[PDB]
Design a protein around this ligand. Structure first.
Ligand SMILES: CC(C)=CCC/C(C)=C/CC/C(C)=C(\F)COP(=O)(O)OP(=O)(O)O
Ligand SMILES: [Mg+2]
Ligand SMILES: [Mg+2]
Length: 492
């Protein structure tokens, strides 16, 4: 068969072999400068864990020497190893509804580490609506830090301290979020009422160091990765048998609200994880997991905003394009919810930008939202005026992909970035919904790119695309193989 099919096959054997007997594809997260710096600062002011703080220091210097991250994280590392131009630079026109909260978050962090002055804002600026559980704790921690850092500790209300109590529980980070626990602990250490519980958690934070001496942003993304892998495998001509244990492992980890978190032990459900599990289960076990499917469908239908879109975590927060398209695709299978599906799709078409693109949210490349939108625009059957409206929106999106394709056949994070396999995989999934591949065509060139970039061990090593907190990148290496396999499975 073709070189693409041969590439697909080798990659699928690799992905299958990585699924564990428990039905999960391990997806650990790499060390990140930001959390290693916060961990270095915490352990250093508490004068604890000399061994671990020595490693964290060597990791920070080496990473800055050999693999510098964005200017914000560099300023954070430089601030702890020892800058307002770094905020302007890290958020270079960060186009997103969170930009205001982020400018506050990131400046308060830098100030907490002694790199700049705290923001001259009313204390209410740190007040955030109920959303993901970790955001509320993070804003409360930064409010505390700002109150002690500026010399006004009497400003801290007892409802602020209360929000940090999960950080003092033993074991792994609450919600698997290291940044959130490290921020809470940096605030908690200023409270004598809470220092008794602090020694125990410093020993478990210190034991989280990865072999390279760094601290990961999160524990991992095994649910997100397993679901994505299972969905890719179930789109092969003949799916491997292991999709059944994978589906079982996902379904038994669902949260009380019927949604799914990104990792084992994450109580916060989100729309992105839920849609991948739902799409996957509907193909590999619609009957064996009928109930899980129906509960996940009910979860999404409860998050839905009145404007037709879907948020990531909690209704009432801004709808997002990628999430709205993802939900429309996952909800389309049942004809009971065609009203909600069409309204979601219409939301997608209204927010398409004049150049045919959509948004940069949880992925730092434009192709991610393009591929979500194109699937919804072309997967949800329509007729008459609507079919023509959606086909036009899909054409403009695929055309934007063709306009920005690089000579080597791939796409980068942005139009003038060098190609990377993940950004290209997203593009391929979308292009696979356009016209059939012709020689020299955009999709044809994209497949060849993926073929050439395959590693002798059958896998892919790609620049990461995941953001969190946005726009900060974090690296889950296992996602590369999965998303490329997802692309090759749609395209072949
Ligand atoms: C799983 C995917 C790909 C989509 C849904 C969102 C999730 C679970 C992302 C990955 C896991 C975490 C903790 C974040 F990136 C979230 O980080 P934050 O809540 O600090 O991000 P801001 O809201 O501050 O931008
Ligand atoms: Mg955040
Ligand atoms: Mg976070």
């Amino acid at each position: 068969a073709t070189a693409v099919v041969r590439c697909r096959t080798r990659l699928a054997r690799r992905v299958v072999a990585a699924v564990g007997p428990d039905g999960l594809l391990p997806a650990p997260c790499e060390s990140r400068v930001l959390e290693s710096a916060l961990a270095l600062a915490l352990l250093t002011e508490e004068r604890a864990e000399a061994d671990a703080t020595a490693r964290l220091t060597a990791y920070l210097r080496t990473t800055l020497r050999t693999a510098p991250p964005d200017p914000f994280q560099c300023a954070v590392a430089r601030a702890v190893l020892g800058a307002g131009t770094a905020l302007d630079a890290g958020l270079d026109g960060f186009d997103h509804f969170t930009a205001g909260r982020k400018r506050l978050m990131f400046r308060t962090v830098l100030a907490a580490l002694g790199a700049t002055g705290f923001p001259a804002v009313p204390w209410e600026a740190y007040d955030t609506r109920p959303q993901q559980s970790w955001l509320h704790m993070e804003m409360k921690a930064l409010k505390v830090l700002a109150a002690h850092g500026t010399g006004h500790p009497d400003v801290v209300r007892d409802e602020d301290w209360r929000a940090l109590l999960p950080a003092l529980e033993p074991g792994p980070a609450w919600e698997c979020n290291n940044l959130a626990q490290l921020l809470a602990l940096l605030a908690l250490r200023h409270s004598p009422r809470h220092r008794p519980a602090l020694g125990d958690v410093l020993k478990h934070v210190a034991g989280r160091l990865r072999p390279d001496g760094g601290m990961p942003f999160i524990d991992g993304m095994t649910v997100f990765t397993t679901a994505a892998a299972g969905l890719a495998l179930s789109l092969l001509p003949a799916p491997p048998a292991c999709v059944t244990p994978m589906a079982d492992a996902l379904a038994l980890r669902r949260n009380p609200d019927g949604g799914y978190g990104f990792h084992s032990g994450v109580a916060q459900s989100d729309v992105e994880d839920t849609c991948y599990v739902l799409e996957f289960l509907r193909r590999a076990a619609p009957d064996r997991h009928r109930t899980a499917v129906a509960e996940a469908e009910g979860y999404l239908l409860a998050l839905r905003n009145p404007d037709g879109g879907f948020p990531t975590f909690a209704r009432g927060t801004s709808s997002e394009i990628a999430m709205t398209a993802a939900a429309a695709s996952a909800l389309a299978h049942d004809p009971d919810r065609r009203e909600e599906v069409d309204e979601a799709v219409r939301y997608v078409v209204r927010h398409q930008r004049p150049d045919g693109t959509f948004e940069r949210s949880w992925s730092r490349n434009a192709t991610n939202a393009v591929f979500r939108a194109v699937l919804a625009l072309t997967g949800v059957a329509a007729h008459g005026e609507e079919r023509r409206s959606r086909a036009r929106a899909a054409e403009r999106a695929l055309a934007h992909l063709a306009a920005t394709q690089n000579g080597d056949g791939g796409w980068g994070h942005a139009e003038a970035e060098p190609s990377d396999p993940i950004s290209t995989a997203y593009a391929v999934i979308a292009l696979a919904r356009g016209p059939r591949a012709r020689p020299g065509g955009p999709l044809d060139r994209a497949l060849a790119y993926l073929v050439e970039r395959q590693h002798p061990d059958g896998g892919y090593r790609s620049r990461p695309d995941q953001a969190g907190p946005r726009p900060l990148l974090y690296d889950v290496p296992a996602l590369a193989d999965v998303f490329v396999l997802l692309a090759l499975a749609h395209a072949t």
